[PDB]
Design an enzyme around this catalytic site. Structure first.
Site, PDB file in Angstrom:
ATOM      1  N   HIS A 121      -4.746  26.158  90.566  1.00  0.00           N
ATOM      2  CA  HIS A 121      -4.347  27.511  90.992  1.00  0.00           C
ATOM      3  C   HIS A 121      -5.539  26.540  92.070  1.00  0.00           C
ATOM      4  O   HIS A 121      -6.379  26.440  91.892  1.00  0.00           O
ATOM      5  CB  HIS A 121      -5.126  29.171  90.786  1.00  0.00           C
ATOM      6  CG  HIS A 121      -5.365  29.219  92.201  1.00  0.00           C
ATOM      7  ND1 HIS A 121      -3.836  29.639  92.997  1.00  0.00           N
ATOM      8  CD2 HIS A 121      -6.424  30.056  92.675  1.00  0.00           C
ATOM      9  CE1 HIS A 121      -4.975  31.074  93.685  1.00  0.00           C
ATOM     10  NE2 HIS A 121      -6.525  31.120  92.909  1.00  0.00           N
ATOM     11  N   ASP A 145       2.271  28.734  89.729  1.00  0.00           N
ATOM     12  CA  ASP A 145       0.442  28.898  90.748  1.00  0.00           C
ATOM     13  C   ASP A 145      -0.348  30.033  89.511  1.00  0.00           C
ATOM     14  O   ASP A 145       0.248  30.651  89.164  1.00  0.00           O
ATOM     15  CB  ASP A 145       0.360  29.360  91.684  1.00  0.00           C
ATOM     16  CG  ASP A 145      -0.876  29.780  92.282  1.00  0.00           C
ATOM     17  OD1 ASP A 145      -1.611  30.585  92.003  1.00  0.00           O
ATOM     18  OD2 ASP A 145      -1.783  28.960  92.890  1.00  0.00           O
ATOM     19  N   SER A 147      -5.864  30.035  98.575  1.00  0.00           N
ATOM     20  CA  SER A 147      -5.538  30.981  97.929  1.00  0.00           C
ATOM     21  C   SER A 147      -5.703  32.293  98.908  1.00  0.00           C
ATOM     22  O   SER A 147      -4.765  32.297 100.087  1.00  0.00           O
ATOM     23  CB  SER A 147      -6.418  31.559  96.948  1.00  0.00           C
ATOM     24  OG  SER A 147      -7.890  30.709  97.370  1.00  0.00           O
TER      25      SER A 147
END
Ligand SMILES: *[C@@H]1O[C@H](CO)[C@@H](O)[C@H](O)[C@H]1NC(C)=O
Ligand SMILES: [Cl-]
EC number: 3.1.1.98
Length: 345
Positions: A296, A252, A144
């Protein structure tokens, strides 16, 4: 436990987390291995004083080291268990906690402090004395905001090492769920909350508020004042000098959240177009792994061995890539979320 990573707080205490507590890194040395995995943690960001105060109450771990535990167990790519990490269990393992809320871009000293780029720099240099000086491969990895951090810092770290006199160390990157699109939102909204601010606007404000720096080779391509472009993977990727493997869910969640999608007719199309634009940006990225799942992050989750694309697992895709420096441009062609059977839940 023998196998836990151990916390080291930075000796230079001027390089700090948001609140001024010392930043740091966890380390598990591996006898004999010349492979170093340095992981950059993610977890969003804050781009104004008000959003940062609010994050400080809700998510203090991400702005302070006060309560960091002295040990941590490596998971996924950082696990020392062969079943959990079949090729690289024996590597030197490093976890760098994310406490600068700046997508790892903050590089100045002086309210909240944003020193992400300097934390990385500082951790690299401390590691030289703990064995990084004899490394063959340094893999800068991240999830991330950490994934985007990889892209912002991997060439900086390659330069840092050659400058310090260690040119033989091969610096590479692995960016997981940090490859975003600066697209138009599904339904418009004014930028006020972190999670629903348009990605473009979020970085514009972030970069100024943080005093954030971007890689030099990407900075030169865009006008002065438009450095926000270099936070987007498809725009920074092409001028990278270090090799980088890109892992990205085609759908995502963080991307959907910032596009103000919340989970129809028009939405189906938008989502399906997202997937398509994503694929298009990975076309010239041979070292990629992009499954059609709605999710994610993946690489420090214990189930990272499960996902497959065209019969190849993520650990195997990475190992082949490593060996090339067995397929590698692993992008699902099926067009709707979860069409890949191997997705997680
Ligand atoms: C320690 O970190 C501070 C803040 O980034 C920096 O200004 C100082 O020069 C560092 N000390 C060194 C490099 O000895
Ligand atoms: Cl040893």
């Amino acid at each position: 436990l023998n196998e836990d990573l151990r916390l080291h707080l930075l000796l230079n205490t001027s390089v700090t987390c948001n609140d001024g507590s010392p930043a740091g890194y966890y380390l598990k040395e591996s006898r004999g291995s010349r492979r170093w995995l340095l992981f950059l943690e993610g977890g969003w960001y804050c781009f104004n004083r008000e959003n940062c105060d609010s994050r400080y109450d809700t998510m203090r771990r991400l702005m302070s080291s006060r309560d960091w535990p002295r040990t941590r167990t490596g998971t996924g790519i950082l696990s020392s268990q062969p079943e959990e990490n079949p090729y690289w269990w024996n590597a030197n393992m490093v976890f760098i906690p994310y406490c600068s809320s700046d997508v790892w871009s903050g590089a100045s000293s002086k309210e909240y402090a944003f020193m992400g780029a300097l934390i990385i720099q500082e951790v690299v240099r401390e590691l030289l004395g703990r064995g990084l000086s004899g490394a063959k491969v340094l893999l800068l990895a991240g999830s991330s905001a950490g994934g985007t951090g990889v892209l912002l810092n991997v060439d900086r770290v390659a330069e840092q090492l050659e400058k310090l006199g260690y040119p033989a160390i091969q610096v590479r990157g692995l960016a997981d769920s940090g490859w975003f699109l600066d697209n138009k939102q599904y339904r418009h909204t004014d930028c006020v909350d972190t999670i629903t601010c348009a990605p473009t606007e979020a970085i514009r404000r972030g970069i100024r508020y943080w005093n954030g720096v971007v890689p030099e080779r990407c900075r030169r391509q865009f006008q002065e004042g438009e450095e926000w472009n270099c936070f987007f993977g498809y725009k920074v990727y092409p001028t990278l000098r270090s090799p980088v493997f890109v892992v990205q869910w085609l759908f995502d969640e963080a991307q959907l959240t910032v596009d103000n999608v919340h989970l129809q007719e028009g939405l189906r199309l938008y989502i399906q177009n997202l997937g398509r634009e994503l694929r298009h940006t990975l076309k010239d990225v041979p070292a990629s792994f992009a499954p059609a799942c709605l999710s994610h992050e993946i690489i420090i989750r214990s189930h990272w061995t499960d996902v497959q694309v065209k019969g190849t697992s993520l650990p195997r895709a990475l190992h082949c890539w490593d060996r090339s420096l067995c397929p590698v441009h692993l992008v699902d062609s099926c067009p709707w979320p979860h069409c890949n059977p191997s997705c997680p839940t």
